[PDB]
Amino acid sequence: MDRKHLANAIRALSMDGVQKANSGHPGAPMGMADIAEVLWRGHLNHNPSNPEWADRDRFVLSNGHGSMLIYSLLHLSGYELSIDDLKNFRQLHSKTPGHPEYGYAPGIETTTGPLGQGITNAVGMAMAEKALAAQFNKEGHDIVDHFTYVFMGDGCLMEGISHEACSLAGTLGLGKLIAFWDDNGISIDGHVEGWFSDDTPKRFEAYGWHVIPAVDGHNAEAINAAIEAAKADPRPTLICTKTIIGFGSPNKSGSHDCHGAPLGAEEIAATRKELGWEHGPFEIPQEVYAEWSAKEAGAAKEAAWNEKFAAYEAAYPELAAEFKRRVNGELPAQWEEKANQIIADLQANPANIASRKASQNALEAFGKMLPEFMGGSADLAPSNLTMWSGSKSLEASDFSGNYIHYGVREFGMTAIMNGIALHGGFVPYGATFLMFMEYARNAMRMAALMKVQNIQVYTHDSIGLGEDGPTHQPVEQIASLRLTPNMSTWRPCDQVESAVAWKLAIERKDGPSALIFSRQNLAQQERTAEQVADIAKGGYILKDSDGKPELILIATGSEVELAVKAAEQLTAEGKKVRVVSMPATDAFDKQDAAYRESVLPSDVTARIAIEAGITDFWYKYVGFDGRIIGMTTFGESAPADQLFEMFGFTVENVVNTAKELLAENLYFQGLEHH
Amino acid sequence: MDRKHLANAIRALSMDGVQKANSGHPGAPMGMADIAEVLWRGHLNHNPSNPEWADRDRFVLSNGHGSMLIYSLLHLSGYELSIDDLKNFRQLHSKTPGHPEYGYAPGIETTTGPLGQGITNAVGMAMAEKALAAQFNKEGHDIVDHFTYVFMGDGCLMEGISHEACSLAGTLGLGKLIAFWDDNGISIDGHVEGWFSDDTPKRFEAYGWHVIPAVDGHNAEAINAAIEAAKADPRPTLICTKTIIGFGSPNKSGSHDCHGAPLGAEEIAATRKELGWEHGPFEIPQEVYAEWSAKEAGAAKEAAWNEKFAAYEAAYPELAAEFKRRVNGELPAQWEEKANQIIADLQANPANIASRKASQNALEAFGKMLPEFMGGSADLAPSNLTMWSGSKSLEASDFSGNYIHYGVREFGMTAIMNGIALHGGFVPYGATFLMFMEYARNAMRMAALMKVQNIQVYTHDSIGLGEDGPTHQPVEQIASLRLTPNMSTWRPCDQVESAVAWKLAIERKDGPSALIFSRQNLAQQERTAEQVADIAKGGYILKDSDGKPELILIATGSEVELAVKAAEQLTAEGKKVRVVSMPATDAFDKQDAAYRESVLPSDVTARIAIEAGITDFWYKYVGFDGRIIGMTTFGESAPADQLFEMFGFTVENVVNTAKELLAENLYFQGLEHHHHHH
Lengths: 674, 678
Ligand SMILES: Cc1ncc(C[n+]2csc(CCOP(=O)(O)OP(=O)(O)O)c2C)c(N)n1
Ligand SMILES: Cc1ncc(C[n+]2csc(CCOP(=O)(O)OP(=O)(O)O)c2C)c(N)n1
Ligand SMILES: [Mg+2]
Ligand SMILES: [Mg+2]
Description:
The structure is a homodimer.
Chain A: H1 3-21, H2 27-31, H3 33-42, E1 58-61, H4 67-77, H5 83-87, H6 117-136, E2 148-152, H7 154-158, H8 160-171, E3 177-183, E4 186-187, E5 190-191, H9 200-206, E6 210-216, H10 220-232, E7 237-242, H11 265-275, H12 286-292, H13 295-315, H14 317-327, H15 335-348, E8 353-354, H16 355-367, E9 373-377, H17 381-385, E10 403-405, H18 410-423, E11 427-433, H19 441-450, E12 454-459, H20 477-482, E13 488-490, H21 495-507, E14 512-516, E15 521-522, H22 529-535, E16 540-543, E17 551-555, H23 560-572, E18 577-581, H24 585-589, H25 593-599, E19 607-614, H26 619-622, E20 627-631, H27 640-646, H28 651-663
Parallel strand pairs in A: 1-2, 2-3, 3-7, 6-7, 9-10, 9-11, 11-12, 12-14, 13-14, 17-18, 17-19, 19-20
Antiparallel strand pairs in A: 4-5, 8-15, 16-18
Helix pairs in contact in A: 1-3, 1-4, 1-11, 3-10, 6-8, 6-18, 8-18, 13-14, 15-21, 16-21, 18-19, 23-28
The structure holds thiamine diphosphate (2 copies) and magnesium ion (MG) (2 copies).
Binding site for Mg(2+) (chain A): 154, 184, 186
Binding site for thiamine diphosphate (chain A): 65, 113-115, 155, 184, 259, 436
Active site (chain A): 410 (proton donor)
């Protein structure tokens, strides 16, 4: 069968899927159909019967609004995604949401939609392939060998994160990363000349990429030749495919009218005429299904690879076992035993250190067990302390290491790490000052949405950092992480909580981990072995009164010592005071009602939350009858001890607030609470 | 004097200021001291006695951590920044914080520190100059004519926002923007080759910039030639100044050790010897002060510009009064009565339209009175509805307009706008989907920290946007804006609250405004004239009960209609229900205790907050005894009305929740009723 009929099946399913939904974006799927057909039928190595084949090529659709394109590709080639699924595009609980979502449909490699992050995830997956290949491939046994293909549009290229991702991808020499730019000259505002006029080829040459300019995106021969050139060049390749958006529509192609609205029934009939497509809505001839099917090619490719791996396993049994364990996301053999012993050693051996130093100590203790670590920092290795004795930097000519110098690229680093975690085989971690979490904010939201592991070491977490001032001092950042669905946010109060937070983060594979560490030194607290085990519950009783407490101090991270010292002075003045350490509110929230009531009994309304962060978050735990000692403003440039005093993080202020609060409990005004 | 000696006065003050503080970054100041001396003493047009002079050149230190460089320049050239101020570097309440802060120290044009935003601010500043020139300059009367100079380091160039700002600046032909890149081969991790290897001149060439590569940043003649070439070229110019970081220090120069730590007393003495600087800590000889002073040149330059403006005013009195009005940040003559008439007309003439359309209607109605408007959208003009009939796009060849197509550049747009607001002459607004506020988040924070106007039209504010799904559907974003100090976040519930929010945002010149607009139609609510006036208080009684309420429904934005309907049903079943509209919690928080108690009385604890956003924010207003009807998950891709029903935003659920809540609260009251204590 002729090629153009096969490409035209993509266009028909796309425009029909969008029309039945009366919602969605037919432009880009129709403009890129030829490129997709050449790539998918001619070059992509994948098995539709096993979307998790470890050595499959990875395809990412970074211009994610053209979701019908990838849904069309998955259905046509034989994945478990049916015509009825396409008929349910953008409908309640379907496998075909309006933007493609990881784990919603088989073969979707990442969730896209926020522009720029698809290409950045793809840079990550290319880095994972290259590192796995450098760590596992042996002479005559190259068991890691697959490419990363990305489609992107003008929106992705305008976004700043494309500059971070692709600059670093050049430095690191990611020759198996192959990106197709949908150069169609249009974005939502219309003709892009007024706002997007880069020499895009020259830009990517400046990144050290291999760039193939001026490729006719509707010539199957030019597309095939560009892909062949790309696979042969050892630098990442940008293929600049010039296309017509909405290709096939007589009246709406080359216009922003076809970008993100249904074509309409009249225009759709005219498009079928123009393309010579004589089949109605969702009708694919069996001949097309035959020529598009990838099931037997893919079954043969995986069977071959399974034999390739069996040979590898005979010759390198220990390495093969490591490869199996890591690509399945399994922990090391004695993980639980060894990790818990490390934690108990820390509780036995108090150090008063900064929790960022405790973080480095946990990396050193746990990392000896975790060859799958792939750490890094956005140019802050000596302040975040993300390197330990075993850290080895990745470089273009040697990807066998385990540490990435991301440069000043918080957003790119965080979304690269999503691509690494999605790829499999590693436990990635990254780092920056907690303030500059904000530069990478949406990539962390995307990890929560995708339910992938993404461990962020966020140091310098409050006014405790001191002189660098209010552009650096977090105030509201911790709360904005706590308010994010499926974010796990840990603010350890000492080296023991720090190591527990790291152990849980390493184990946390269904969502991101924000590990919040202090610049300044933190006093270690005494804990029974039950209390150590209760750290993992996110909120636990650290100090208790004899008998029911009349006052509960809830504190996090660096403010716990302040709570403990104020509770000591109040106890010596006759008061019954409990101190609750709350390293992770999200873990505390998931504990059963019985546990939570045991920690914060509802009948004790005299509670004070103490945290060098935005106060308004804490009404959740103290309500109207409690008090909050926190921040309500930006910080100031000064030494930290002066900042803590100025902003009220003093034992005297906690004690006075407590006595004032206890006085409001007179005249039965507290006992009346129910 | 020898040129090098005047530059070394910068190096001396910088390293001495860092040493006294035992904190800060001496490397970059010492690296760029020669570039700074040539620029400031040989080209910068400024008046130390009036840092507010309208036609002064703008200087921006984008590598903000080298703050002792700009503090040295300000003190050396004659600004009101004393030796004692420099001796208080990084100390509590000083004029010299660890990163430079606009608003206190004279001469600080923006707050920097977060890498990449300074250069982006400068793009906006150059955009403001070029537009103010196009709108006001006449033949023989060019009253607007200044340059925008920026120093920036490798960190700013690695950051993605530099791509957004400089790509657009190329497209717009900002020829009076002149950026110096501190090309010293070093960042915090060390030698940058393992993580930063762009062909940076070629990169900027690709942006349509004028690039001057390989300038010796310690050669005054080369630096000077580069600047002259820059000012002659009509494209924005990148001057690639190679420097040695910490230049002068024998043992720490060219190394990341001098980046962000004090040099040490012994290294400083060796550095003094190496530089031939024979003066003690903070000691500046008199002939250095005399050679550095810009006071006389600066007073002459401004005096000359004042005469140019007197000539302009004589020739063009109406344009001149407009220039003075806009440069002084004043609103048009009849703003208050005309804007209030627009708002009263909307209350009188109900329309059920999406608040994003009401946003467009406010732009149209208010924009006719505001030639200072400078709007835009990050490639979403037809969805955000940011263009009205008077919108005219800026073009490289025609900057007389009032609208910017920012492209898909949320972070760059937002930080450019801070630059526009800092420059003066405009009321800027930008726009994107509320979700992609997250891309621009820290530029919104910087606006709030700096207390500058920055109006953002954030549309498609909830699961109400429907099928695009959870990558687009905001859940926790409104609450993140509400927790930011000096953020004003407005979620209007109909076209009347929408126009009030726009009126107050246009007036809000000391902080950013986040205006949260719906995709879908919103029912207009009825209001007395007093209720219309109380919209501006951020929270007010929309529907009161007959007698003291036993239940309060608190709602925002698209969920106010839901609360009104639920109250109607509850009132029909005999309950006493109050509906509070809370378009802006931050404005409500600032009302006095009497007003807040009148809206939310402490006696009435049966409260329900209703909002298609993250639930846990609302504990501030409902406490432990209320309920919250909101989101606790990401959204899902489906039609909007099925999402609202699935996530509990129905009259049935609100009514059922209220009835349970009241039965519970009446039960607990009953256990207490016969007790004798208060
Ligand atoms: C970060 C981000 N900002 C904004 C949007 C909104 N948006 C979706 S598609 C699009 C237009 C970009 O056009 P292009 O990538 O050229 O695609 P085409 O219309 O050619 O298919 C925009 C602004 C988004 N999805 N993500
Ligand atoms: C957005 C952001 N990310 C990280 C930082 C932390 N930081 C401050 S200075 C710096 C080093 C950047 O190096 P460069 O700009 O080359 O400065 P130089 O040391 O040469 O003066 C870093 C990572 C920051 N200030 N802002
Ligand atoms: Mg396009
Ligand atoms: Mg540098």
